[PDB]
């Protein structure tokens, strides 16, 4: 039973490699989204003000 | 392009029934989910971020202010540059993760090799009815140490000895 | 959008309890509370409590109620009914919700009935 | 009264923005609202609501205010029917919601009762049936020889105390190709669309339905029969055995799922996974109240690295065996979490 349990560490590291990489990668790639948020807000304000 | 990343992430999640009890891995999962949801919501709701001066200005006749706001927008087109600040601390997290992964897999590989050796030995080297007591004593001096210690202590009892071994006692 | 999704949920759950109560009135009269399961019995008791709590004294009706009128703020009443819906005041008798204002008045009336009256 | 009639009319109205913002005119569905007997404040609410959700551009508001003369209320649905017939005869598809139309009925009753015309039943004139039928029959699906246009009618009836068995209600039901019943009973019982599955019947079940939603797995077709069974053996009926318990749980979870927030038109590419989840993985839901958030989480799950399935069921229309297997796998993966 211990053998069967340890059989599952055989390839966990290979997948969790890309998992841990892309986790932080995607979490920090929202910087461009944050920079786009202010531009989108400015555009929304401009459209609203000219609608006014 | 994103399909492979979260596909392998949830593959690891499907493997993660055994590392249950984690604190922030699932929390980081909902964090990624919330951030990407805000991504797609802002990208879908984002109308073309420019005033249609050809038509959406021509409808207004006495504006006197469309030129001002358009000039302001044009001057503020470079709103801000991307923040690629993280170049070493994230690398530190990755080198820690690499160290943990390599030491882990070394441990796993050596443990499986040891346990196939164990089963292979146990298959045809199991003297159930022909094991020598002298061989047992020589293999493990710990049982010898225990025996002399309890002999010199005077407590001849061996706690937990009638639990599995019968007595056939005529008494 | 106008309410705030909290007072709206409280009102929705109040309507839930009252509609279930009215639907079960027929078998309550015919059979009784025993026939209902534990969830239905709890729902009926809670709905009775809310319906009693709906009574509010009015300053222009003191000669009729005999109790000074109460002016309950919106936040006060929504918080009180949210607390009632969670079952925090299930042990309190339903009569304590009769001619009261906020949940503090409910607690006061329950204490008076439990100590001075009983 | 105020059981969600104009509300479901509004969700039908707003859902068309998905296709009206495109280019395929064969899928564009122009909208015509008939505000006969409604008050001007309600019509302003309506027009602003359509303005917010980018819907006023393709919708048409024909308002017959109660303060306006009764002949105007009588005629406004007919004029809106002509407006929709313009789209219908030019190869376009028009949805006209004859909201109220009981106010038009009473306005025409006023017209007859001051025009010296003797009335019929409950002082209603003779041709309220003929009026309703003649007005509604203008809504039809034209053949390809006539441009393949269509004109869809969504009339309303404001019943008095749930009295479906009344002259005007049963009269209009005999005209329309099916009815959508809403009562306060289900409205306060929790059903937010207030869809009374019993007396709500559509005259074209298999047709006029998305192929991905009609039968695909079979259960989606006898969905209505299953709901009728659940009503017939609801909590009042004795819980016979484990099969009966499973049927009751299935019905309760299904009616839990059907609740939908106002001004939230949920597309068929997102409807189909939810209806399928109501047949497999529905029974093990963690409390009935949590299905509300479970639906949102399942939508989010289908959005992430499953948009291929969503666009496949949106574009193709039919569901293949491999598509059904993929949907089952996704449902199992989600219910596992
Ligand atoms: N999803 C929903 N479906 C139906 N009604 C809703 C929903 N959400 C909120 N409501 C409430 O139900 C009422 C629907 O009544 P309405 O359709 O206006 O009938 P009428 O126009 O005949 O008064 C609205 O006042 C609204 O506040
Ligand atoms: Mg209405």
CA distance A9 to B107: 10
D10 CA to centre of ligand 2 in angstroms:
9
On whether the CB atoms of residues D89 and D145 are closer than 8 A, the answer is: no
Resolution of this model in Å is 3.5
Closest CA to D20 of D9, D12, D31: D31
Buried-state track D307-317, b at ≥16 Cβ within 10 A, e below 16? eebbebbbeee
How far, CA to CA in Å, does B90 sit from each of B86, B104, B106? Answer: 6, 21, 24
- Cβ atoms of residues D213 and D237 within 8 Å: no
How many Å apart are CA D156 and CA D13, to the nearest integer? 14
For residue B17, count CB atoms less than 10 angstroms from its CB and return exposed for 0-12, middle for 13-18, buried for 19 or more: exposed
Length reported for chain B: 171
**What is the 3-class SS of chain B, one letter each residue?**
CCHHHHHHHHHHHHHCCCCCCCCCHHHHHHHHHHHHHHHHHHHHHCCCCCCCCCCCCCCCCCCCCHHHHHHHHHHCCCCCCCCCCCCCHHHHHHHHHHHHHHHHHHHHHHHHHHHHHHHHHHHHCCCCCCCCHHHHHHHCHHHHHHHHHHHHHCCCCCCCCCCCCCCCCCC
Q: Which residues does residue D35 pair with via DSSP β-bridges, in sequence order?
A: D63
How far apart (Å, rounded) are the C-alpha atoms in residues D312 and D318?
9
Cβ contact D273:D304 at 8 Å = no
- The alpha carbon of residue B125 is apart from the nearest alpha carbon of chain A, in Å, by 19
Q: What is the DSSP string of D178-245?
A: EE----HHHHHHT-SS---TTT-EES-SSTTS-HHHHTTTTTTTTHHHHHHHHHHTSTTS---SHHHH
Atom of ligand 1 nearest to the CA of D182: 4
Q: Read off the tokens for D299.
A: 């939508």
Ligand 1 near D5 CB (within 6 A): yes
Handedness of CA D207, D213, D216, D219 (dihedral sign): negative
Both tokens of B104, joined, read 């882990």
Write the burial class of residue B32 (CB in 10 Å: 0-12 exposed, 13-18 middle, 19+ buried): buried
Burial of C7-25, coded b for 16+ CB within 10 Å and e otherwise, reads: beebeebbbbbbbbbeebe
Q: Record the tokens describing residue D198, joined without a space.
A: 């019993």
Q: Do D303 and B13 touch (CB under 8 A)?
A: no
> Which H, E and C letters describe D248-306, residue by residue?
HHHHHHHHHHCCCCCCCCCCHHHHHHHHHHCCCCCCCCCCCCCHHHHHHHHHHHHHCCC
Cα–Cα dist D50/D64, whole Å: 18
Question: DSSP secondary-structure letter at D152?
Answer: E
- The closest alpha carbon to D153, from D90, D51, D77, belongs to D77
- Main-chain phi, psi angles of A41, to 5 degrees: -65, -40
In chain B, what residues touch A34 (CB-CB under 8 Å)?
Answer: 83
Contact in structure between D62 and D83 (CB atoms under 8 Å): yes
Residue B78, token pair as written in the block = 């470079």
Interchain contact C/D (3 or more Cβ pairs less than 8 Å) = yes
What whole-number distance in Å separates Cα of residue D193 and Cα of residue D4?
Answer: 7
C113: CB partners within 8 A, 6+ apart:
C93, C95, C96
Residue D95: strand, helix, or coil: strand
What the block records as the tokens of D146 is: 């006539």
D32 beta partners: D60, D96
Residues D102, D34 contacting (CB under 8 angstroms): no
Number of neighbours of residue D184 by Cβ within 10 angstroms: 16
Q: Give the residue on B whose Cα is nearest the Cα of D306.
A: B3
Distance CA C38, CA D42 (A): 44
Atom of ligand 1 nearest to the CA of D262: 1
In chain C, % helix, strand, coil (3-state, to 5) comes to 65, 0, 35
User: Quick count: other Cβ atoms within 10 Å of Cβ D8?
Assistant: 20
Measure in Å the smallest separation between the Cα of A13 and chain B Cα atoms: 6
């Amino acid at each position: 039973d211990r053998i069967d349990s340890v059989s599952q560490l055989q390839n966990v590291a290979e997948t969790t490699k890309v998992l841990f990489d892309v986790s932080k990668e995607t979490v920090e790639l929202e910087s461009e989204a944050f920079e786009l948020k202010q531009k989108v807000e400015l555009a929304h304000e401009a459209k609203a003000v000219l609608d006014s | 392009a994103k399909s492979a990343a979260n596909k392998l992430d949830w593959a690891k999640v499907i493997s993660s029934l055994r590392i249950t009890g984690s604190t922030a891995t699932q929390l980081s999962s909902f964090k990624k989910r919330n951030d990407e949801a805000r991504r797609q919501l802002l990208e879908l709701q984002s109308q073309p971020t420019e005033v249609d001066f050809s038509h959406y200005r021509s409808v207004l006749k006495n504006t006197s202010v469309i030129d001002k706001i358009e000039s302001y927008v044009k001057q503020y087109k470079p709103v801000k540059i991307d923040a690629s600040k993280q170049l070493q601390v994230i690398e530190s997290f990755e080198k820690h993760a690499m160290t943990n992964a390599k030491e882990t897999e070394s441990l796993v590989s050596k443990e499986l090799k040891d346990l196939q050796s164990t089963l292979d030995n146990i298959q045809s080297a199991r003297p159930f009815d022909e094991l020598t007591v002298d061989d047992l004593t020589k293999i493990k001096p710990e049982i010898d140490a225990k025996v002399e210690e309890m002999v010199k202590k005077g407590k001849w009892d061996v706690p937990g000895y009638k639990d599995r071994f019968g007595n056939l006692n005529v008494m | 959008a106008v309410v705030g999704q909290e007072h709206y949920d409280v009102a929705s759950k109040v309507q839930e309890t009252l509609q279930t109560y009215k639907s079960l009135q027929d078998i309550i009269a015919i059979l009784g509370m025993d026939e209902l399961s534990e969830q239905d019995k709890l729902t009926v008791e809670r709905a009775r409590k809310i319906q009693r709590f709906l009574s509010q004294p009015f300053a222009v009706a003191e000669v009729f109620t005999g109790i000074p009128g109460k002016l309950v703020r919106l936040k006060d009443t929504v918080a009180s009914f949210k607390a009632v819906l969670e079952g925090k005041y299930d042990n309190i008798p339903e009569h304590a919700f009769y001619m009261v204002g906020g949940i503090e008045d409910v607690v006061a009336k329950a204490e008076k009935l439990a100590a001075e009256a009983n | 009264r105020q059981t969600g009639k104009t509300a479901v009319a509004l969700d039908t109205i707003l859902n068309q923005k998905r296709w009206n913002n495109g280019s395929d005119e064969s899928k564009k569905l122009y909208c015509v609202y008939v505000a006969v007997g409604q008050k001007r404040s309600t019509v302003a609410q309506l027009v602003q609501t359509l303005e917010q959700h980018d819907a006023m551009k393709y919708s048409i508001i024909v308002a017959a205010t109660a303060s306006e003369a009764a002949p105007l209320q009588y005629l406004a649905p007919f004029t809106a029917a002509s407006i929709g017939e313009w789209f219908r005869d030019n190869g376009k598809h028009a949805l006209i919601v004859y909201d109220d139309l009981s106010k038009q009925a009473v306005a025409y009753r006023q017209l007859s009762l001051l025009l010296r015309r003797p009335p019929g039943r409950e002082a209603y004139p003779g041709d309220v049936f003929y009026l309703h039928s003649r007005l509604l029959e203008r809504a039809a699906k034209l053949s390809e020889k006539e441009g393949s246009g269509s004109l869809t009618a969504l009339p309303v009836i404001e019943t008095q105390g749930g009295d479906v068995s009344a002259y005007i209600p049963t009269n209009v039901i005999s005209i329309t190709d099916g009815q959508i019943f809403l009562e306060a009973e289900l409205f306060y019982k929790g059903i937010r669309p207030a869809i009374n599955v019993g007396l709500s019947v559509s005259r074209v079940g298999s047709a006029a339905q998305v192929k991905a939603l009609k039968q695909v797995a079979g259960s989606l077709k006898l969905f209505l029969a299953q709901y009728r069974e659940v009503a017939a053996f609801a909590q009042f009926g004795s819980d016979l055995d484990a099969s009966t318990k499973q049927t009751l749980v299935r019905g309760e979870r299904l009616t839990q799922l059907l609740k939908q927030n106002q001004y939230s038109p949920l597309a068929t590419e997102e409807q189909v996974p939810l209806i399928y989840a109501g047949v497999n993985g529905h029974l093990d839901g963690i409390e009935l109240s949590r299905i509300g958030e479970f639906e949102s989480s399942f939508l989010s799950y289908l959005k992430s690295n499953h948009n291929e399935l969503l666009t496949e069921i949106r574009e193709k229309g039919e569901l293949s065996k491999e598509l059904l297997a993929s949907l089952k796998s996704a449902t199992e993966s989600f219910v596992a979490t």
